[PDB]
Design a protein around this nucleic acid. Structure first.
Ligand SMILES: [Mg+2]
Ligand SMILES: [Mg+2]
Ligand SMILES: [Mg+2]
Ligand SMILES: [Mg+2]
Ligand SMILES: [Mg+2]
Ligand SMILES: [Mg+2]
Ligand SMILES: [Mg+2]
Ligand SMILES: [Mg+2]
Ligand SMILES: [Mg+2]
Ligand SMILES: [Mg+2]
Ligand SMILES: [Mg+2]
Ligand SMILES: [Mg+2]
Ligand SMILES: [Mg+2]
Ligand SMILES: [Mg+2]
Ligand SMILES: [Mg+2]
Ligand SMILES: [Mg+2]
Ligand SMILES: [Mg+2]
Ligand SMILES: [Mg+2]
Ligand SMILES: [Mg+2]
Ligand SMILES: [Mg+2]
Ligand SMILES: [Mg+2]
Ligand SMILES: [Mg+2]
Ligand SMILES: [Mg+2]
Ligand SMILES: [Mg+2]
Ligand SMILES: [Mg+2]
Ligand SMILES: [Mg+2]
Ligand SMILES: [Mg+2]
Ligand SMILES: [Mg+2]
Ligand SMILES: [Mg+2]
Ligand SMILES: [Mg+2]
Ligand SMILES: [Mg+2]
Ligand SMILES: [Mg+2]
Ligand SMILES: [Mg+2]
Ligand SMILES: [Mg+2]
Ligand SMILES: [Mg+2]
Ligand SMILES: [Mg+2]
Ligand SMILES: [Mg+2]
Ligand SMILES: [Mg+2]
Ligand SMILES: [Mg+2]
Ligand SMILES: [Mg+2]
Ligand SMILES: [Mg+2]
Ligand SMILES: [Mg+2]
Ligand SMILES: [Mg+2]
Ligand SMILES: [Mg+2]
Ligand SMILES: [Mg+2]
Ligand SMILES: [Mg+2]
Ligand SMILES: [Mg+2]
Ligand SMILES: [Mg+2]
Ligand SMILES: [Mg+2]
Ligand SMILES: [Mg+2]
Ligand SMILES: [Mg+2]
Ligand SMILES: [Mg+2]
Ligand SMILES: [Mg+2]
Ligand SMILES: [Mg+2]
Ligand SMILES: [Mg+2]
Ligand SMILES: [Mg+2]
Ligand SMILES: [Mg+2]
Ligand SMILES: [Mg+2]
Ligand SMILES: [Mg+2]
Ligand SMILES: [Mg+2]
Ligand SMILES: [Mg+2]
Ligand SMILES: [Mg+2]
Ligand SMILES: [Mg+2]
Ligand SMILES: [Mg+2]
Ligand SMILES: [Mg+2]
Ligand SMILES: [Mg+2]
Ligand SMILES: [Mg+2]
Ligand SMILES: [Mg+2]
Ligand SMILES: [Mg+2]
Ligand SMILES: [Mg+2]
Ligand SMILES: [Mg+2]
Ligand SMILES: [Mg+2]
Ligand SMILES: [Mg+2]
Ligand SMILES: [Mg+2]
Ligand SMILES: [Mg+2]
Ligand SMILES: [Mg+2]
Ligand SMILES: [Mg+2]
Ligand SMILES: [Mg+2]
Ligand SMILES: [Mg+2]
Ligand SMILES: [Mg+2]
Ligand SMILES: [Mg+2]
Ligand SMILES: [Mg+2]
Ligand SMILES: [Mg+2]
Ligand SMILES: [Mg+2]
Ligand SMILES: [Mg+2]
Ligand SMILES: [Mg+2]
Ligand SMILES: [Mg+2]
Ligand SMILES: [Mg+2]
Ligand SMILES: [Mg+2]
Ligand SMILES: [Mg+2]
Ligand SMILES: [Mg+2]
Ligand SMILES: [Mg+2]
Ligand SMILES: [Mg+2]
Ligand SMILES: [Mg+2]
Ligand SMILES: [Mg+2]
Ligand SMILES: [Mg+2]
Ligand SMILES: [Mg+2]
Ligand SMILES: [Mg+2]
Ligand SMILES: [Mg+2]
Ligand SMILES: [Mg+2]
Ligand SMILES: [Mg+2]
Ligand SMILES: [Mg+2]
Ligand SMILES: [Mg+2]
Ligand SMILES: [Mg+2]
Ligand SMILES: [Mg+2]
Ligand SMILES: [Mg+2]
Ligand SMILES: [Mg+2]
Ligand SMILES: [Mg+2]
Ligand SMILES: [Mg+2]
Ligand SMILES: [Mg+2]
Ligand SMILES: [Mg+2]
Ligand SMILES: [Mg+2]
Lengths: 206, 210, 60
RNA sequence: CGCGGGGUGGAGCAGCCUGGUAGCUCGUCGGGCUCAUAACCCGAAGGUCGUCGGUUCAAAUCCGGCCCCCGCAACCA
RNA sequence: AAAAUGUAAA
RNA sequence: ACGCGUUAAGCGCGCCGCCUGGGGAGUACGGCCGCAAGGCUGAAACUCAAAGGAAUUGACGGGGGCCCGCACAAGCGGUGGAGCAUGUGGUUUAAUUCGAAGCAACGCGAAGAACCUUACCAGGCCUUGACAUGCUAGGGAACCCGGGUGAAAGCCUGGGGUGCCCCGCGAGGGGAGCCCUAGCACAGGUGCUGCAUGGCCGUCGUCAGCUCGUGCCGUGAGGUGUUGGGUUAAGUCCCGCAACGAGCGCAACCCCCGCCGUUAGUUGCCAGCGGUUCGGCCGGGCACUCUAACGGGACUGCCCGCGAAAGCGGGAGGAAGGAGGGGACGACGUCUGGUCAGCAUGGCCCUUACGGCCUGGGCGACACACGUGCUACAAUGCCCACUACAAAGCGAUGCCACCCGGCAACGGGGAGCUAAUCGCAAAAAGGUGGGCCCAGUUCGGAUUGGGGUCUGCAACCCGACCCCAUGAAGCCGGAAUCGCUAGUAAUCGCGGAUCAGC
């Protein structure tokens, strides 16, 4: 075990922060402490939405949370009723003037954090791990990707002996900075332990 | 007093006289085999292994070889020796036969021409022979009381298990099984040896009152 | 000693000296970079995650 | 009963003749090598000389008694 | 030419 | 299968000999031969679930060939010995909380243990709890004040506000909220299992490796490709090839350093002038230095020799040349590696306690052993005086100029800076001057006595710092062992993270 995080390695190179704002020194540690609590309620509530990334911006005092989803409708609701109570709970906890924002995810088969969820969800529902990796790596590849790879660790199939299990097509030059790649983690809760889900999507260099 | 070290580590055998108060009372219940389950220090790979050691505790007993012989329990015969000597060997009861009555052990001596030179020798041998005969009795008593206590077999011969991986020690006799083994290895035996003392004492009421 | 102790940390004490800084995410007391209110491990993750603004892999 | 020998660090032996000064090999303990054990290398500890007396400024050493071990002797009838 | 050995459970 | 193949192990016929799982056993008995040694013939009980033949893939070799690394060698400085610091073993203890174990545990989790931290210990305590979501019954009202006993936690207990919602003419009434006393769901656990797991990390290893697709060979495991010659730090490229390609690796793409440029001119800078109260100090200016954002630059492009090519060896011009120096980056996998105690988490277990609070103790113990370290043993030295030259960082809960008091640690005052303004800040080796005389010393600074400063509720256990006195071992270290190949080692100081302080 020795490989670097793909996002952390490509900051300002092929990837931008999921939080963009300045903060001197006296308030950083609670801007962030709140910032973190923001993805708290967001990820917790918008599971059904398939949230792929939370972009939290902060202007003068006011926050500016942009959110990316696969199927947008869940977020909004009948007459946009969930989307209102959304920004309601937000300013209710932040105490700062907030900002609703939603832009959909065009191709759900090209967002690793999405792929990971759908995988981990499957194995939560007793689906064959091996033949489902090849399935996911297919759809992601067949959805135009330049490369794709999925990894699963832990007690596969409920087996006492835990193990790694993965598949891949195309390229995943993880050493190459010039390459853009999407990373995605997920955690499959199970009646027999916990299994980690990793996705790599190579969306061409630049 | 004895300690045969087995290279690393131990003690392939060690014997000690534990002197004090209530020693045989409390350390009595260790007589038998002790199973150990742990990843051995000797292990090349990473496999868990089962091993065992035997413990025998015989109490410190009194012991005293009798004040030699006492002529009261002894028959001495005097008579003529056999073979060379001429005139003198024929007319002189120089042969001795001392029969030690309690054991039936007998010596004879017609070595020298002097009757008490021979009685001396025959008293010397008879001494060494009754001593040696009791020593051997006392030997295969001690040597055979251990055979039972020590429990010949191994891996499966009795008493209690010390499992290092799960941290459980457990006495198979009283079926106690408290899994605070750390302390037990540090000599905190009482939370183990006291349960046996009570359970064994409950087998004393139900013994002539049941 | 865990959630009960993370609560002692939040409580304004009896004497100022008994202040200790916990992690604002995992709850660790040792190795606590105060700039983030985070521990040295919680720090590392979010940094890779890119959820800590401006901070990036150093190199020279 | 008689004559000769012996008892000295845990084992096995020097030193006694010629009084002053305790040695050897092994073992043991601590540190090295080695993944580890041994072999190997470095350093250390350990006896108040069987036991009583006596001689002497001084006794393992010289002298007397006793105890234990060893060898020899014990013939003429 | 140096230089012995490694018990017993995945 | 290896192989055999008109000298068959092929295709056929004739005849003799022989085998029928391993061990027991070529043994026993009997018989025949022999001078003997022994030979020929030749069993059984018993026991095992295999023994065995060829071939495959690895690993291994005190096998071979070719390469490589501070591996040896060549070198400079060290540990091992001394005193101290710290981590560990061990022993000790009421507890000396737990984990880490050769390389890859041992100044490691600890980037801050007096209380706190704290998971251990003794003791006084609490029981729907220090925290979450709810559900009850007497149902009071928020929240400030107090008594009280106490080491605190805790337990007991005295005054109030004269709130709020429905709206009732009304004397009261029911709502909500948080608190309140019991009760029920439940919380809680740094209790076990890293050998039930995720995550992250160490390691072989920055080593050049690891594989897939299809095809072809093989009864098959599998092989071919990946091999071969050249070459390279490199499965790096080249040529060859029953193989043709492809992926993860290597390289590149990223940061930092070295050269030049464009843009920029304060809080930076000062070259010529002006003012000079001989100071970047005012006026003044962006040129240089700097600062920091975008570029340029190097391509084996050029020359010689060799070469089939790849490239190799030299040459030049250049700040820089064949990877310029440094970093970031760690393949398929291996170690039942590490960690359930950062967090996550399946199963297991504790429930007026295996949960919680507090006071005090302990994690700092000391017959001993080790790891890493600091300071030394001195003259290429040490002390005092004076005087220079740094980069990186930190600081409006803070850093502190400068006067004042103090031998000092520091205290009292007090200017500026939220900072390329102002400050910590003195750089230290260096240089100059004076002293020391080869001594257990003006080397050395452990030990201890006395007297103080600061932070803190509080420095007995247990802090750092100052002053006087004390002035130990140590004369260069047995066996053995470590680092480093160029701005490196050695040496010298400075800063920061944690943090009241250390
Ligand atoms: Mg691995
Ligand atoms: Mg790495
Ligand atoms: Mg990666
Ligand atoms: Mg979803
Ligand atoms: Mg081993
Ligand atoms: Mg066994
Ligand atoms: Mg006797
Ligand atoms: Mg008798
Ligand atoms: Mg008679
Ligand atoms: Mg006769
Ligand atoms: Mg007569
Ligand atoms: Mg007569
Ligand atoms: Mg007569
Ligand atoms: Mg006779
Ligand atoms: Mg048993
Ligand atoms: Mg264990
Ligand atoms: Mg057990
Ligand atoms: Mg008791
Ligand atoms: Mg503190
Ligand atoms: Mg003689
Ligand atoms: Mg003589
Ligand atoms: Mg002699
Ligand atoms: Mg004699
Ligand atoms: Mg004698
Ligand atoms: Mg002697
Ligand atoms: Mg002797
Ligand atoms: Mg001799
Ligand atoms: Mg003599
Ligand atoms: Mg003599
Ligand atoms: Mg030794
Ligand atoms: Mg060895
Ligand atoms: Mg004398
Ligand atoms: Mg003498
Ligand atoms: Mg004498
Ligand atoms: Mg003598
Ligand atoms: Mg004598
Ligand atoms: Mg005779
Ligand atoms: Mg004769
Ligand atoms: Mg005669
Ligand atoms: Mg052997
Ligand atoms: Mg053997
Ligand atoms: Mg072994
Ligand atoms: Mg297997
Ligand atoms: Mg063939
Ligand atoms: Mg031919
Ligand atoms: Mg022929
Ligand atoms: Mg032939
Ligand atoms: Mg033929
Ligand atoms: Mg045929
Ligand atoms: Mg057959
Ligand atoms: Mg058979
Ligand atoms: Mg035969
Ligand atoms: Mg034969
Ligand atoms: Mg027969
Ligand atoms: Mg025969
Ligand atoms: Mg014959
Ligand atoms: Mg003959
Ligand atoms: Mg012959
Ligand atoms: Mg013969
Ligand atoms: Mg023979
Ligand atoms: Mg080396
Ligand atoms: Mg060397
Ligand atoms: Mg150690
Ligand atoms: Mg544990
Ligand atoms: Mg009070
Ligand atoms: Mg529960
Ligand atoms: Mg277990
Ligand atoms: Mg793991
Ligand atoms: Mg490790
Ligand atoms: Mg390399
Ligand atoms: Mg490296
Ligand atoms: Mg193939
Ligand atoms: Mg073949
Ligand atoms: Mg390649
Ligand atoms: Mg060829
Ligand atoms: Mg002047
Ligand atoms: Mg000008
Ligand atoms: Mg100008
Ligand atoms: Mg310019
Ligand atoms: Mg440039
Ligand atoms: Mg040619
Ligand atoms: Mg050249
Ligand atoms: Mg470079
Ligand atoms: Mg260079
Ligand atoms: Mg590089
Ligand atoms: Mg495993
Ligand atoms: Mg396992
Ligand atoms: Mg493993
Ligand atoms: Mg209960
Ligand atoms: Mg001067
Ligand atoms: Mg000067
Ligand atoms: Mg610099
Ligand atoms: Mg500082
Ligand atoms: Mg600050
Ligand atoms: Mg304050
Ligand atoms: Mg301060
Ligand atoms: Mg002054
Ligand atoms: Mg003054
Ligand atoms: Mg003054
Ligand atoms: Mg003065
Ligand atoms: Mg001041
Ligand atoms: Mg003033
Ligand atoms: Mg001020
Ligand atoms: Mg100076
Ligand atoms: Mg000296
Ligand atoms: Mg003092
Ligand atoms: Mg104060
Ligand atoms: Mg000393
Ligand atoms: Mg010297
Ligand atoms: Mg000298
Ligand atoms: Mg000297
Ligand atoms: Mg250099």
């Amino acid at each position: 075990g020795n490989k670097i995080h793909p996002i952390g390695f490509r900051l300002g190179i092929t990837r931008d922060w999921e939080s963009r704002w300045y903060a001197g020194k006296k308030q950083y540690r609670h801007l962030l402490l709140e910032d973190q609590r923001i993805r708290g309620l967001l990820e917790k509530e918008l599971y059904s939405a398939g949230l792929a990334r939370v972009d939290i911006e902060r202007a003068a005092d006011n926050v500016a949370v942009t959110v990316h989803v696969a199927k947008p409708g869940v977020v909004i609701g009948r007459g946009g009723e969930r989307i209102r109570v959304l920004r309601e709970e937000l300013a209710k906890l932040t105490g700062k003037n907030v900002a609703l924002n939603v832009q959909e995810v065009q191709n759900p088969n090209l967002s690793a954090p999405l792929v990971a969820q759908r995988v981990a969800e499957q194995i939560e529902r007793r689906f064959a791990v091996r033949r489902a990796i090849k399935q996911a790596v297919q759809r992601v590849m067949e959805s135009g990707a330049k490369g794709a790879k999925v990894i699963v660790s832990g007690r596969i199939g409920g087996a006492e002996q835990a193990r790694t299990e993965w598949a891949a097509q195309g390229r995943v030059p993880l050493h190459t900075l010039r390459a853009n790649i999407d990373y995605g983690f997920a955690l499959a809760r199970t009646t027999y332990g916990v299994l980690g889900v990793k996705a790599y999507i190579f969306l061409g260099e630049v | 007093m004895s300690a045969s070290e087995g290279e690393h580590g131990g003690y392939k055998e060690i014997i000690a006289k534990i002197s004090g108060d209530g020693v045989y009372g409390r350390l009595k219940f260790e007589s038998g085999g002790h199973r150990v389950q742990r990843v051995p220090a000797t292990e090349s790979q990473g496999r868990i292994h089962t091993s065992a050691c035997t413990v025998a505790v015989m109490p410190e007993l009194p012991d005293a070889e009798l004040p030699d012989i006492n002529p009261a329990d002894l028959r001495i015969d005097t008579f003529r020796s056999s073979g060379a000597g001429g005139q003198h060997v024929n007319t002189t009861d120089s042969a001795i036969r001392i029969t030690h009555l309690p054991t039936g052990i007998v010596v004879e001596c017609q070595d020298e021409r002097s009757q008490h030179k021979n009685k001396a020798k025959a008293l010397s041998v008879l001494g060494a022979r009754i001593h040696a005969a009791e020593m051997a009795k006392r030997q295969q008593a001690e040597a055979s009381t251990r055979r039972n206590l020590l429990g010949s077999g191994d891996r499966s011969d009795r008493n209690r298990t010390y499992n290092f991986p799960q941290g459980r020690v457990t006495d198979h006799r009283i079926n106690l099984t408290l899994y605070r083994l750390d302390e037990v290895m540090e000599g905190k035996l009482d939370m183990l040896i006291e349960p046996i003392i009570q359970e064994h004492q409950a087998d004393q009421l139900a013994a002539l009152s049941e | 000693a865990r959630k009960a102790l993370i609560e002692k940390a939040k409580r304004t004490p009896k004497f100022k000296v008994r202040a200790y800084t916990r992690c604002v995410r995992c709850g660790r007391a040792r190795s606590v970079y105060r700039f983030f209110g985070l521990c040295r491990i919680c720090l590392r993750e979010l940094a890779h995650k890119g959820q800590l603004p401006g901070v990036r892999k150093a190199s020279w």
